[PDB]
A paper describes a structure:
The autonomous non-LTR retrotransposon long interspersed nuclear element-1 (LINE-1 or L1) is one the most abundant mobile elements in the human genome, comprising 17–20% of its content. ORF1p acts as a nucleic acid chaperone that binds L1 RNA, while ORF2p provides endonuclease (EN), reverse transcriptase (RT) and RNA-binding activities through three distinct functional domains. L1-EN initiates de novo L1 integration by producing a single-strand nick at a genomic site generally fitting the consensus target sequence 5′-TTTTT/AA-3′ (6,7,24,25). L1-EN belongs to the family of metal-dependent phosphohydrolases that includes apurinic/apyrimidinic endonuclease 1 (APE1) and DNase I, which are part of the exonuclease-endonuclease-phosphatase (EEP) domain superfamily.
To confirm the position of the catalytic metal in L1-EN, we soaked crystals of WT L1-EN (formed without DNA) with 20 mM MgCl2 during cryoprotection and refined the structure to 2.0 Å resolution. We modeled a Mg-water cluster with four water molecules at the electron density near Glu43. In addition to the four water molecules coordinated by Mg2+, there were other water molecules near the active site. The one with the strongest electron density is coordinated by Asp145 (2.6 Å) and Asn147 (2.7 Å). Notably, Asp145 and corresponding aspartic acids in DNase I and APE1 were proposed to activate nucleophilic water during catalysis. Upon superposition of our Mg-bound L1-EN structure with the structures of our DNA-bound L1-EN complexes, distances between the modeled Mg2+ and the scissile bond OP2 are 3.8 Å for B-form DNA and 1.4 Å for the alternative conformation with the phosphate rotated. We modeled a L1-EN-DNA complex with a bound Mg2+ ion by forcefield relaxation in the mixed constraints with active site amino acids around Mg2+ coming from our structure of Mg2+-bound WT L1-EN without DNA and the rest of the amino acids coming from our structure of L1-EN-D145A/Y226K complexed with dna14. Indeed, when modeled into the rotated phosphate DNA conformation, the transient holo-phosphate moiety became strongly coordinated by the Mg2+ ion via two of its oxygen atoms (at 2.0 Å and 2.1 Å from Mg2+), replacing the two water molecules and maintaining near-octahedral Mg2+ coordination. Notably, about halfway through the rotation, the phosphate approaches W5, which is coordinated by Asp145 and favorably positioned for nucleophilic attack on the phosphate. Asp145 carboxylate may serve as a general base that accepts a proton from W5, thus liberating the hydroxyl anion. pKa estimation for Asp145 using PROPKA indicated a strong upshift of pKa = 6.5 for this side chain, in agreement with a general base function.
Residue numbers in the entry: 6 to 238
Write the structure that this text describes.
Amino acid sequence: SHITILTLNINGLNSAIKRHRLASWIKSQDPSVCCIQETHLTCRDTHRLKIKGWRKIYQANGKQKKAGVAILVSDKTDFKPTKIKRDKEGHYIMVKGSIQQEELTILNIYAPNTGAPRFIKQVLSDLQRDLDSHTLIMGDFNTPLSTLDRSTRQKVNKDTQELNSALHQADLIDIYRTLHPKSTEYTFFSAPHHTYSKIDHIVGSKALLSKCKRTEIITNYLSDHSAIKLELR
Ligand SMILES: [Mg+2]
């Protein structure tokens, strides 16, 4: 029975109507694990995020209606947690555990608009003791990782090159780009610039590659980001 992992920047959940439509969308997608970014919930308001079928919901949130991340696990998934690491500022959350007795390490990250790849590299640094051979890093990196991740096809800046080098040192690869080397799909559109970019990513341990059956982008009506879904064997 295959595990599916979904990542979606939801662009805010402080409204009830949004929360109801996220719930219907998640229940239609039926993911085993769902990573959400920019819930915009404060540390006070986390119990507003509830969805039938996904009772286990881990969340990292700051004090303001900014950022905010969450990892939802399906009630149908036999999940045993071992470690949950929450960003005090609500920009990332790591959940470690086992499903069907396989260990999985999931880092859900929401990088800020400014200095995104530096922030990510620092997070990898802060969390290096918990990175392993079954690590998935997904979320809104707010940065392309390679030239084909932007409609402009411009080269990635120096900060991004260092992040990629840090990823390589940790034996981490862009799973989406590995499965789709020539892909020209995008997850975000910036109207000021008429620019399209893939700033949402699924990065993982190289040892997980053989378990990565399919990965695809899912456009939607809920948010200004498209989702990414990964199917594990
Ligand atoms: Mg946003």
